[PDB]
Amino acid sequence: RAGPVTWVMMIACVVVFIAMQILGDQEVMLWLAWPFDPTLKFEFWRYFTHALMHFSLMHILFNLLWWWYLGGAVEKRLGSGKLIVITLISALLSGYVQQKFSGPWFGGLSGVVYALMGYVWLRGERDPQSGIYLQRGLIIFALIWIVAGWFDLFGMSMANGAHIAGLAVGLAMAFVDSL
Ligand SMILES: *C(=O)c1cc(N)ccc1[C@@H](*)C(=O)OCCc1ccccc1
Ligand SMILES: CCCCCCCCCO[C@@H]1O[C@H](CO)[C@@H](O)[C@H](O)[C@H]1O
Ligand SMILES: [Cl-]
């Protein structure tokens, strides 16, 4: 069974997605988006809660599938705290990069997913004895997912910088952990 962090993130993402359909996207953003006014700067949740908002059925579905699988394996084999820190750092840095080039109106677990991909793969590669690795088939489907994003496939128009930021964090932490 999926652990407490894997579970609560999925719940939170569904609750927020529901809230977005009922109230509208823009209204949910006013509460959860990255600070878009200087007066909102000390509302600390906003540097993270942008990761809980999704705009498309397809990104929430696939973001949560990857989260469920990679997050779940990290949680079970390496503990809940590990998953928390990976999420918080990747959300913060991917958010930071995104807002820098495209402004404060954005959201999604896309960045956090890149970080779990990076983490799980590089950790399996460098430190087999940890128990976690990214299976061959999944490397392939991860790469297709990455490629679909990079080249704007399937009518998608996302920013690459934030995704790079997320992957960098996952690699960095995998590097640190395999010493
Ligand atoms: C982030 O949300 C993101 C990042 C990348 N690189 C690709 C997609 C997404 C969102 C997502 O999962 O969208 C669905 C893509 C998809 C999956 C399967 C078939 C067709 C399209
Ligand atoms: C560009 C010139 C005008 C700027 C207008 C920006 C107003 C700042 C909005 O603040 C936000 O208002 C929301 C509802 O209005 C609340 O949900 C939220 O708690 C609050 O933080
Ligand atoms: Cl989305």
CATH of the domain at 26: 1.20.1540.10
Experimental method: X-ray
- Segments forming the whole domain that contains residue 21: 1-179
Structure tokens at 20: 């977005």
Structure tokens at 64: 């949560």
Rounded to the nearest whole angstrom, what is the distance from the C-alpha of residue 8 to the centroid of ligand 1?
22
Q: How many domains does the chain have?
A: 1
Q: What does the buried/exposed string (b/e) look like for 112-140 if buried means 16 or more CB atoms within 10 Å of the residue's CB?
A: bbbbbbbbbbbbbeeeeeeebbbeeebee
> What are the CA-CA distances from residue 19 to residues 6, 27, 96, 160, 162 (Å)?
20, 9, 25, 27, 25
Resolution attained, angstroms: 2.2
Rounded to the nearest whole angstrom, what is the distance from the C-alpha of residue 131 to the centroid of ligand 1?
27
Give CA–CA dist 143/84, Å, rounded: 24
Ligand nearest, relative to CA of residue 42: 2
DSSP state of 104: S
Ligand nearest, relative to CA of residue 28: 2
Task: List CB-based neighbours of ion ligand 3 within 5 Å.
Answer: 54-56, 59, 108
The total number of residues written for the chain in this structure: 179
Rounded to the nearest whole angstrom, what is the distance from the C-alpha of residue 45 to the centroid of ligand 3?
19
| Residue 37 beta carbon below 6 angstroms from any ligand 2 atom | yes
